[PDB]
Write a protein that binds this ligand. Structure first.
Ligand code: FDX
Length: 239
């Protein structure tokens, strides 16, 4: 696990990103801009994990509720359907999670976020966008421990709610290993910030949490987050 090779991957994908790895409370940093680890960025779709948790915990929804698309034009055609909270998570389908947020309401959301202690724990006044254009901001270090805690079922929520949310996050299950995570991409701010926060379940049950953060750019493909992360984790011999 050479901190040089990984620098060269971020070097050569022309970006500015850091990869945070936490393995039972030791945090290692990789990339080409390690200073990113301690600066706050808007969380974007990575805040859906926390949004589900709050919603499920407060019984504003459940994993079987179907969210009806009422016909407004949305940003992707894949989002123009009825779907479950879990389907909306796989697609990062913002409008669904804005509905949920509006159900929670400002007060509940503000109390929950500051109770969890997530990022700056500031959501301002508009309860269905604070995680896309501020004011809510979080460092990649805080994100990896948040997701580390979730993987270990150690967040301040009931266990069944955390398990419900973990099951929406399954990204890939190959050769004995399991990968969980949530992509993010804040497109409507400068600079654009892209995320991929989650964890690896090693076949023996060891948990390795991770939080990819990079500066984003409109012409980049979606998979540049997965390509960067996959070959970084294979390098570190986490897979
Ligand atoms: C906010 O919309 C943001 C969450 O950070 C979205 C934008 C990108 S792109 C997203 C659109 N739908 C997914 C997909 O591949 N399709 C077309 C179903 C991907 C994003 C992300 O994936 O990080 N989340």
């Amino acid at each position: 696990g050479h901190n040089q090779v990984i620098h060269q991957y971020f070097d050569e994908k022309n970006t500015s990103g850091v990869l945070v790895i936490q393995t039972d409370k030791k945090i290692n940093l990789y990339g080409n801009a390690l200073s990113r680890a301690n600066t706050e960025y808007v969380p974007a779709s990575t805040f859906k994990m926390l949004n589900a948790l709050i919603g499920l915990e407060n019984q504003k929804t459940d994993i079987n509720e179907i969210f009806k698309w009422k016909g407004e034009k949305r940003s992707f055609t894949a989002w123009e359907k009825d779907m479950t909270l879990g389907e909306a998570m796989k697609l990062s389908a913002v409008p669904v999670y804005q509905e949920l947020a509006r159900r929670i309401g400002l007060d509940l959301m503000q109390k929950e976020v500051k109770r969890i202690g997530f990022g700056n724990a500031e959501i301002g006044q508009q309860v269905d966008n604070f995680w896309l254009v501020g004011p809510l901001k979080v460092t990649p270090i805080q994100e990896v421990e948040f997701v580390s805690q979730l993987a270990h079922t150690q967040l301040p929520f009931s266990e069944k709610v955390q398990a419900n949310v973990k099951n929406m996050l399954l990204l890939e299950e190959s050769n004995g290993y399991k990968i969980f995570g949530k992509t993010g991409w804040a497109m409507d701010i400068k600079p654009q910030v892209g995320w991929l926060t989650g964890w690896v379940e090693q076949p023996d049950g060891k948990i390795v949490a991770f939080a990819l953060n990079m500066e984003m750019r409109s012409e980049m493909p979606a998979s540049i987050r997965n390509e960067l992360l996959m070959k970084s984790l294979k390098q570190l011999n986490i897979i």
